[PDB]
Design a protein around this ligand. Sequence first.
Ligand SMILES: Nc1nc2c(ncn2[C@@H]2O[C@H](COP(=O)(O)OP(=O)(O)NP(=O)(O)O)[C@@H](O)[C@H]2O)c(=O)[nH]1
Ligand SMILES: [Mg+2]
Lengths: 130, 171
Amino acid sequence: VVGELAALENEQKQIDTRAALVEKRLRYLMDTGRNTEEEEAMMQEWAMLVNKKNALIRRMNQLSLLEKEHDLERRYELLNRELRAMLAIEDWQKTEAQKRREQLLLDELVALVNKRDALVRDLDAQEKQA
Amino acid sequence: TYDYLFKLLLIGDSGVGKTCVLFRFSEDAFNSTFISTIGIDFKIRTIELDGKRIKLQIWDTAGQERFRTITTAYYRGAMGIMLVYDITNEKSFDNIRNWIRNIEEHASADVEKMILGNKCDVNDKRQVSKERGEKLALDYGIKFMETSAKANINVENAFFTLARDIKAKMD
Ligand SMILES: Nc1nc2c(ncn2[C@@H]2O[C@H](COP(=O)(O)OP(=O)(O)NP(=O)(O)O)[C@@H](O)[C@H]2O)c(=O)[nH]1
Ligand SMILES: [Mg+2]
């Protein structure tokens, strides 16, 4: 659904430029007090266009967090298979730079689990506000 | 899309069955292959317990000695801990009291612990009887279950009891 998320970013650009073309009109029709007929019609569109923007943002939030979760999991799954192959080689066979290379691979692996944990922590603070 | 998030932790010696117990709970399968955990991992499974949606974040520690300073950083903020031994391995049951002292030196004060005697399908290699796992956890004031990740004995029961003991404590 990668082609959906790029389409929703331009759908959001269609929404808030229509919403910017509505809010200056609805301010001018209220401050001058011009037409009460097109003031009822502009308020039900602007309430629709704000609630359509809010439903499009929170679906774009849950698609962006799922895309980051999929990318961090496949980077974790790759780096774990590289580390399993490195740690199966004995200590005396590799060089001293290659032993400190696999320590950095281990630190990067703990960093990826903490990044995946941060997506869990961020989704926990998002749902209690929603 | 859920109600509450509970942080769980699995600790114990290498080879007792920590990853296999989590793989049974989160994906309903069993691996025969010893694939040792490197550092630290977690798995998510969202359950339906008592009409309520509970996501479980269950951290899986590497039991080897070379990863033990990484796994000590994950004790704080665990809401529930499984201490796993192997019922076919006398020394891993003996090491549970070292893991008890590793919990109480690093974890939170109110964390709910539970001892799992894993590999309870392997009767002909049993070195630790079921009565001795029952008396040790009753001594610690702690629930006990004999599990088998291979035979799917009491795995889902262990996690759903540990989340029931968390959710009753919120009430
Ligand atoms: N018969 C039997 N074998 C089991 C059971 N659980 C795990 N095993 C076997 O025991 C071995 C170790 O399992 P594993 O889950 O890797 O243990 P671990 O505690 O996660 N190891 P580590 O701390 O190094 O990551 C594997 O070969 C697995 O197939 C069980 O319930 N029954
Ligand atoms: Mg493991």
